[PDB]
Amino acid sequence: VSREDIEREVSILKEIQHPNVITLHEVLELVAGGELFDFLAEEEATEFLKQILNGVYYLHSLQIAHFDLKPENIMLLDRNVPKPRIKIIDFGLAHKIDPEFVAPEIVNYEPLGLEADMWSIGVITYILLSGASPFLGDTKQETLANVSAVNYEFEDEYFSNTSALAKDFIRRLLVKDPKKRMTIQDSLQHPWIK
Template identity: 65%
Template structure:
């Protein structure tokens, strides 16, 4: 199981139609000077680019399109359209902004806000540990971004340190930016949605158990996973069985208030998971 969707089921009277995204059938190179590679994934490469008309810097995400239904290489165009449609609805200081979209025979190119401060994952690795106050500042920004999404009934479904970026890592309090909406879905009332997807150590129990999904899945994990096992099967088993503890080595100086907040996030029964629309 990886970040590619493996299985999807909708049950209900009707699935709301989404307005089709507009992809410019023009050469992205005519409008942007493409620079160095910033990162890559299974079917996408992100490069720095500069808008020729304004001189502004952006990030160009080249997504490889699947060329046939028989192929397993590339991303289905309908999945790219879903990502673009969601990004076009989003305007929040803690979420990456979509600027433009281009398409050619092999790729769809998303022109995105350039977030140059690196991944929260790398920032944490360099610092080795955060104080509770520092962690609170990051969590607050992540939750504000999520609250904005959830008001719009959008679930991210792939919230992990690699998808949480810093606008400027040298700022006194770096601004958080949520990125990568490749697995994001708009949750429709009365329509059951199930899927097996995501990154194993960060998926919620309802994903592991192939149960109906909602906004609650985003509240599961956004930092270091306490469920990581020696194998993928061990990890998924730990999640399903809720095997975790507050080891004194890592939580000896953590307040009970913070531990209680973590317990509320790591709640297997979705009825009791923190609701960002009512929690303060």
């Protein structure tokens, strides 16, 4: 790992102290419970979700975007505890966020930001409610195409009885324009989550 990258990760890790994010002692706490999803294989979807949202709120508080939020990066402290706890881990991609002769790509450059994290959460939310992945394809090229088109459905095999609020919450996250996407503050104020 280009050490710039190593340096970057340690720097983020040092910065962050929250219950829902992994803690670093010296250059990581043990999180025994395993990937969260394994351990599950709406009210209780919501209970786990609230925790993730709480961690991400804190991260975005610090202007840090995780950039790799997915189910294998969500872990349980102990599987065997009455109210179990989740930790976000794997901060390898995290970042702090802030003409005659110029190319269009520069003129039209738009940076990535905390929004990408929110979309991810919507993807995770979909999976949680079903075992299914919204944009997943027979091939990677198929999958990438789906993600750009925002080509997904709530299929009946999985969603016929899912609440309207839950779908709204996901529909609000799964938006192509980053500006129109729900923020982390917005998500926590959402009705399904309240």
